[PDB]
Every structure is written in C-alpha cells, then in structure tokens.
C-alpha cells in the first residue's frame, strides 16, 4: 500500500495473508473471508502454484511477526480459478480457496458481505484499499497492515487512463487524479472494502495498474458485484 | 448481508 497507515488490529477482519511454503514460506497474495470455509482472491496469484498442499492461510493477522512456525492456519483444500482467466489485464482475475477446515467466526477473524445484484446502482464514497503489500515500486513487503482510502472512478475515466488497455464493466477503478494512495506489489487478491448503510461490502478484488499510485493511474479491481453468480455457483454446488 | 454462502 502506498501512502497509507497501519491498521488497528480487528479494523479489516476478514482480511487475511495467503502464504506460499515452497521454496520457502513468505506471503504470497491477500485475499477474503467471504464464507466459513471460503477465501475470495485474485487468479493471478496462482501462477505457477502446481498444488494447493504449499499454500497457507492465516486469518486474525496485524503483523506479520506473528507468523511462526507454530502458528496456526488454514490449509487449502482446493484452489478454483475462474476458468474464463487468462490474465489479470484481460478480467475474470478471480479465485476461490475452498479451506481443508471451517473458520470460526469472531472478533479477530469474519466474513465481509458480497455486493448487492440491486446494488450496482449504488454509489460508494467510503471505499479502503488494504494490504501487506511495498509502499513504493522498490521494496518489500509490510509488517503491519496498510490501510489507505481510495475513491472510486467511473469507467469511462478509468478507460481514458489506460489507452491500449479493455477496462470492461467487469473491471472497477480507484484512485486519486494526482496519485499518491494505492495497492502495490504483495497486495494484490486483497480487498477494496466499501462502507454503505453500515455494512461494509467487498467491492472490488486487487488486481493490476501501471507503476503504484501513480498520477492518472487508477487501481484496477475485480469488480466483485459482476462475479456473485459465478461465487454462488462455486460455494452453494450441490 | 443480502447475499447468503452457506455454511
Ligand atoms: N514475499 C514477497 N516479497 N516480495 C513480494 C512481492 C510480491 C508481488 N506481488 C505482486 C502482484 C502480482 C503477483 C502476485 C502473485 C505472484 C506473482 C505476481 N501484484 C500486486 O500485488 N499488485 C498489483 C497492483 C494492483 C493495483 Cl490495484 C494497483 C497497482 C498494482 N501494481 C503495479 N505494480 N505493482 N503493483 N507482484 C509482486 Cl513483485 C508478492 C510477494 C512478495
């Protein structure tokens, strides 16, 4: 995250750290807590991840300090990548992580709503951007928790920013005219938290831009209210 | 929320 601040511990539960182990364990991607046994991230953060049996989730986390070897997390069952992917610029940048145990929800670690089919018409004001992930283009990834809030961009505008680029409406856009505040490399499959009658909603999944909070360079997003048919059929398979 | 994953 550039330009943004540390977290307060509990601020963005269903937040969490997807690890790799192989060759060594580091952070790998953010992701979600959508369900109790459900992480929603980006596809991208799975290239070259052969087997789900090297990924680790871990829920309830500020620091990443408090990842030792005894720590616990999450083991992956299964990695569901959207089968329209093919690369983060071309959309359908979206993923499921089905956990090999339940997450039990509470002040530390809870789901976050999945937008609204009625709610595409809503305007969202308060939207955050958080993550691990380097305050800059040369660095490395946080201990802390970044936070950063983020305005979102039409379209249209997000378009006019990416000439030789396709922003579809299954994209969303978000950042400021003059840069500044952004994802950056390690925040990626991480939220775009959006405030709206109290409830905060996942509205969008990190996924791509040109440098990091850079002037006229928007944030691109999975825009998460386009894929709640695709997330239902995956999580409610009978 | 609206959108109910089940458990
Ligand atoms: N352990 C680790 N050490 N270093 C690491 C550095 C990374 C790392 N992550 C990334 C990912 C892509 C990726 C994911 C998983 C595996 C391989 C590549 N990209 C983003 O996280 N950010 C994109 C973005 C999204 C948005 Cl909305 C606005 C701007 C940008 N950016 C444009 N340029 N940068 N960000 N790159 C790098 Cl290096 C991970 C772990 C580690």
Known sequence: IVGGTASVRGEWPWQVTLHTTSPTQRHLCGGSIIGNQWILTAAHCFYGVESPKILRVYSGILNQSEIKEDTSFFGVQEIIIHDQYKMAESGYDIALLKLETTVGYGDSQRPICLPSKGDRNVIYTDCWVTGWGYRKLRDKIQNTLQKAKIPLVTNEECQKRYRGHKITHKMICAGYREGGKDACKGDSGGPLSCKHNEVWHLVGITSWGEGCAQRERPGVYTNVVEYVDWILEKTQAV | ?7
Not at chain 2, 1 to 7: E, G, L, N, S
């Open chain 2, 1 to 7: 929320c609206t959108t109910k994953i089940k458990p």
